[PDB]
Amino acid sequence: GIVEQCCTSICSLYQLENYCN
Amino acid sequence: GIVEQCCTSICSLYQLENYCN
Amino acid sequence: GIVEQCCTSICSLYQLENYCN
Amino acid sequence: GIVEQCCTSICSLYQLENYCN
Amino acid sequence: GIVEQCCTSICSLYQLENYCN
Amino acid sequence: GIVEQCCTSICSLYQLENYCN
Amino acid sequence: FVNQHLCGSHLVEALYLVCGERGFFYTPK
Amino acid sequence: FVNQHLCGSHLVEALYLVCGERGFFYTPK
Amino acid sequence: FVNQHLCGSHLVEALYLVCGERGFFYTPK
Amino acid sequence: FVNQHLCGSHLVEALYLVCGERGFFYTPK
Amino acid sequence: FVNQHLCGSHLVEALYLVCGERGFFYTPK
Amino acid sequence: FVNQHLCGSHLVEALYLVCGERGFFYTPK
Ligand SMILES: Cc1cccc(O)c1
Ligand SMILES: Cc1cccc(O)c1
Ligand SMILES: Cc1cccc(O)c1
Ligand SMILES: [Cl-]
Ligand SMILES: [Cl-]
Ligand SMILES: [Zn+2]
Ligand SMILES: [Zn+2]
């Protein structure tokens, strides 16, 4: 999930936007 | 300035990008 | 929703738990 | 204290509540 | 208290130092 | 810059004040 | 409006802490 | 574990900003 | 009320920074 | 006033995220 | 030392939330 | 890189507080 993805590596605002509703 | 523009109304992320270097 | 309920009045931590998964 | 306890290990909201007044 | 003094008006960092241990 | 200086070592409020305008 | 945006920011930080491993949902108005 | 807990607090702040009115679920795995 | 809760959040973050090693006390109204 | 100080805090956090490597400028009123 | 300084900022935010009207002392050791 | 991104978020919050009405540029290098 998001912790694995974005706490091991920076995520941009576009990568983050995948987790949105 | 950014306070006038974005504290009196809500700014999109696009509008916020105006204050990026 | 949580804004109506918790921005118009202050929510306990118990009340906030209503929005936990 | 709290830095030793809770920055070496996660503390829950119950463990944190010990440091309250 | 600090809320009366610093939420009704803006406190300098000097004024905030009054609430340091 | 500031990331090099203050993320490798703590900076006080006085050290930070160098980066101000 | 802005005040709501501000409020929301703090609610998500509080839900993050309260809800812990359960995680949470945030749905604004 | 603390590092992860700290990271997650910023993650949710970032989703709050990026998702806007859409909202989001936070499900740490 | 909520506005005070919000204010308080930011005051504690500011006392944390200002007061440094002395630490601080936070007593709401 | 205080409300503006509060608003500003959240704008800088949002500019930090939005602007990324470009960095940003924050000039209050 | 920076890691600890960052952690402490979240600690105090968390006490602010958990302690509520009781308030708290922050004394880092 | 995440550690640095997290640190930077607190840096800017701290400059916001310390600089006050002067404002600041945030230029990460
Ligand atoms: C915005 C943000 C916060 C935390 C971690 C990331 O990878 C991205
Ligand atoms: C809520 C919180 C913040 C920081 C560290 C912890 O262990 C707990
Ligand atoms: C206030 C602050 C934040 C982050 C790093 C520092 O060195 C100082
Ligand atoms: Cl952090
Ligand atoms: Cl606020
Ligand atoms: Zn706020
Ligand atoms: Zn942090």
UniProtKB/Swiss-Prot annotation, chains A, B, C, D, E, F:
Disulfide bond entries: C6-C11
Superkingdom to which the source organism belongs: Eukaryota
Entry protein name: Insulin A chain
Annotated source species: Homo sapiens (Human)
Protein encoded by which gene: INS
